[PDB]
Amino acid sequence: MNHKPKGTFKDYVRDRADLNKDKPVIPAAALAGYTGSGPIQLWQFLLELLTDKSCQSFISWTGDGWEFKLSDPDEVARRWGKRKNKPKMNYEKLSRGLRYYYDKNIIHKTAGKRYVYRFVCDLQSLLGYTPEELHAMLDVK
Amino acid sequence: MNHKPKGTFKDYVRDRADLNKDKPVIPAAALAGYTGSGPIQLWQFLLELLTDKSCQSFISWTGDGWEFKLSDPDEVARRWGKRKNKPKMNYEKLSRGLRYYYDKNIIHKTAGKRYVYRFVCDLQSLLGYTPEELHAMLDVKPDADE
């Protein structure tokens, strides 16, 4: 409905694409649609970030199966808040959300480490991808 | 976390792709991010549907500039409701949202027709696409001459 001194939407999309954004292997919205889970849930959002090459500086696979690390916990929480429109979201609430998945055997925390968790549900059968395959697509060593 | 008797997520994505779904030229979420509108707005959602090849059976460009038509008003409303978690969304409520855009000069309704509207804001400068370019990309067949 209006233009800025510099940069159209086409430019915006191209610039983000060049930064490897907007192409997660496992988009949360699509995954929620596939499972009919309704509104996006935290574990699905984490999978989207983990399969989005542009997010590797703040959340990444460790290379061991479905183990991952929140390199920058605050940034993960900020993005979750933005996606769900929850401005009060912070690491505190994020971590509580992660601990909630323990009992449900969806995500577990790695002992002896900090900020390292692991999906423990059968994502291979759900997604159709092995961790090794995703690591390869995302250049994880 | 679990498997269904048929089809993994990878298969689900592939099958939707073969139906020309999930690749709108103008994704609403992206446009909201670009414009800094926060939540998706109805006008942005309509642009998404209009640039999504798989939605042409219920909403499409007429071929006249930024004019479009709702072939299935309820389906447009149903999808809008799903995107905003408003299950009661119907054309009655959607049209109320469309009339709102009138005085805002965002979308006007074509006189003489019932389900035909037209974006009247400068989308060329905003999007970086001319209507002809988008029509070409979406294989649009105008209703006027054809």
UniProtKB/Swiss-Prot annotation, chain A:
Disulfide bonds: none annotated. Induction: Up-regulated by retinoic acid, VEGF, TNF-alpha/TNFA, lipopolysaccharide and in response to hypoxia (at protein level). Ubiquitinated; which induces proteasomal degradation. The modification N6-acetyllysine is found at K10. Residues 28-35 are annotated as: Helix HI-2. Residues 9-17 are annotated as: Helix HI-1. It is found in: Nucleus; Cytoplasm. Highly expressed within lymphoid cells. Isoforms c-ETS-1A and Ets-1 p27 are both detected in all fetal tissues tested, but vary with tissue type in adult tissues. None is detected in brain or kidney. Residues 40-120 bind DNA. Residues 123-127 are annotated as: Helix H4. Signal peptide: none annotated. Residues 131-137 are annotated as: Helix H5. Belongs to the ETS family. Transcription factor. Directly controls the expression of cytokine and chemokine genes in a wide variety of different cellular contexts. May control the differentiation, survival and proliferation of lymphoid cells. May also regulate angiogenesis through regulation of expression of genes controlling endothelial cell migration and invasion. Binds DNA as a homodimer; homodimerization is required for transcription activation. Interacts with MAF and MAFB. Interacts with PAX5; the interaction alters DNA-binding properties. Interacts with DAXX. Interacts with UBE2I. Interacts with SP100; the interaction is direct and modulates ETS1 transcriptional activity. This is Protein C-ets-1. It comes from Homo sapiens.
From Swiss-Prot, chain B:
Ubiquitinated; which induces proteasomal degradation. Induction: Up-regulated by retinoic acid, VEGF, TNF-alpha/TNFA, lipopolysaccharide and in response to hypoxia (at protein level). Residues 28-35 are annotated as: Helix HI-2. Residues 123-127 are annotated as: Helix H4. It is found in: Nucleus; Cytoplasm. Residues 40-120 bind DNA. The modification N6-acetyllysine is found at K10. Transcription factor. Directly controls the expression of cytokine and chemokine genes in a wide variety of different cellular contexts. May control the differentiation, survival and proliferation of lymphoid cells. May also regulate angiogenesis through regulation of expression of genes controlling endothelial cell migration and invasion. Belongs to the ETS family. Binds DNA as a homodimer; homodimerization is required for transcription activation. Interacts with MAF and MAFB. Interacts with PAX5; the interaction alters DNA-binding properties. Interacts with DAXX. Interacts with UBE2I. Interacts with SP100; the interaction is direct and modulates ETS1 transcriptional activity. This is Protein C-ets-1. It comes from Homo sapiens. The lineage of its organism: Eukaryota, Metazoa, Chordata, Craniata, Vertebrata. The gene is ETS1. The chain holds residues 297 to 441 of 441 of the full protein.
